[PDB]
């Protein structure tokens, strides 16, 4: 059942700054086969694979996805799966859809039909995630996302009747917007949110924000994490949905000891609430692995995968 498929997600990591950029490598991370073994050996069971299909699909119907790009996603799915890892395949950045859901609907639903048909025979360790962090017009009217996600789920279910499908709320997958999320009567949904509070800390110096939060911000634990995760757990219980927190992490412009405090505090509370999770992210500016030295960032890795349960 879906609660067990969510538990199987367990501990995971995002392969970020990769296929969700305009093209693979544009944001600094080209995928390598060796990543899968590294990630498995470090104690993770799941890869989250951000994919920004919009750059690679035709603009005119039938909105065909470039075959070479599709083959690269095939490779990532196969290499993770054969090596024992779960993989979450999503639609990630999609500026056009967040800006104009109605105008971009046909293209988005064609993209999902292509993905769903292509991967319909993959095992249950392959999960679909309908849309990363809805925002834009979905923030203005969260019901636009409720309507659209039901359409995309319907498309997926025409070829994948029971695959786990991961769905989050608006506000960039903000748990506070779970209140406005409405989901179909489908027994194989996993609900997701992302956790980056306080943005002033986790995203200090992140240039892709406007405004850019200043750096020099330290962090220690108070009660915000516990309050947030309990709110989300009660929503999940009230609606009988399992939870996967598909991104959390703190950017390298923050001081390391604060980042470690924050990362461990969040991981500990996620697991206390029986949330599966995926850390943002493997190898870039939030990374736990430094490709230049081929070394793990041990303080952060051990905050994710502690050697004793209360550490
Ligand atoms: O550039 C706008 C776009 O950036 C995304 O963040 C990237 C960033 O572009 C990249 O330079 C940096 O190294 O990593 C971050 C995180 O992947 C951001 O996620 C988008 O929301 C934004 O539209
Ligand atoms: N196929 C190309 C060029 C193209 C063909 N028809 C279009 C209509 C609108 C915009 C672009 C196009 C693309 O999708 O970019």
Automatic annotation (TrEMBL):
Belongs to the glycosyl hydrolase 5 (cellulase A) family. This is Endoglucanase H. Its EC number is 3.2.1.4. It comes from the Bacteria. GO terms for cellular component: cell surface; extracellular region. InterPro entries: GH, Glyco_hydro_5, Glyco_hydro_5_CS, Glycosyl_hydrolase_5. GO terms for molecular function: beta-glucosidase activity; cellulase activity. Residues 26-206, 221-282 form the Glycoside hydrolase family domain. It is an enzyme of class 3 (hydrolase). One of its GO terms (biological process) is glucan catabolic process. Keywords: Glycosidase, Hydrolase, Signal. It comes from Meiothermus taiwanensis. It holds the Pfam family Cellulase.
């Amino acid at each position: 059942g879906i609660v067990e498929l969510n538990r199987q997600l367990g501990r995971g990591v995002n392969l970020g700054n990769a296929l969700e950029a305009p093209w693979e490598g544009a944001w600094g991370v080209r995928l390598e086969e060796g990543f899968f073994e590294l990630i498995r050996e470090a104690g993770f069971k799941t890869i989250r694979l951000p994919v920004s299909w919009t750059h690679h699909a035709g603009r005119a119907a039938p909105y065909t996805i470039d075959p070479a790009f599709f083959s690269r996603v095939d490779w990532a799915v196969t290499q993770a799966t054969r090596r024992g890892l779960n993989i979450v395949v999503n639609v990630h950045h999609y500026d056009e859809l967040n800006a104009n859901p109605q105008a971009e609907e046909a293209r988005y639903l064609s993209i999902w039909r292509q993905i769903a048909e292509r991967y319909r025979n993959q095992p249950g360790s392959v999960y679909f995630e309908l849309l990363n962090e809805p925002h834009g017009r979905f923030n203005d009217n969260p019901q636009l996302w409720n309507d659209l996600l039901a359409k995309a789920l319907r498309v997926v279910r025409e070829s994948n009747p029971s695959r786990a499908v991961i769905v989050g709320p608006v506000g960039w997958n903000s748990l506070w917007r779970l209140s406005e999320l409405r989901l179909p009567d489908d027994p194989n949904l996993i609900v997701t949110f992302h956790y980056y509070d306080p943005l002033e800390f986790t995203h200090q110096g992140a240039e892709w924000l406007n405004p850019v939060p200043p750096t020099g911000v330290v962090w220690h634990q108070q009660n915000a994490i516990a309050q947030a995760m309990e709110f989300a757990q009660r929503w999940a219980e009230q609606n009988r949905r399992p939870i996967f927190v598909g991104e959390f992490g703190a950017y390298e412009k923050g001081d390391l000891d604060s980042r470690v405090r924050w990362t461990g505090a969040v991981r500990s509370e996620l697991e206390k609430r029986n949330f599966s999770w995926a850390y943002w992210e493997f190898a870039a500016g939030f990374g736990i692995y430094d490709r230049t030295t081929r070394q793990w960032r041990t303080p952060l890795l051990k905050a994710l995968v502690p050697e004793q349960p209360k550490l």
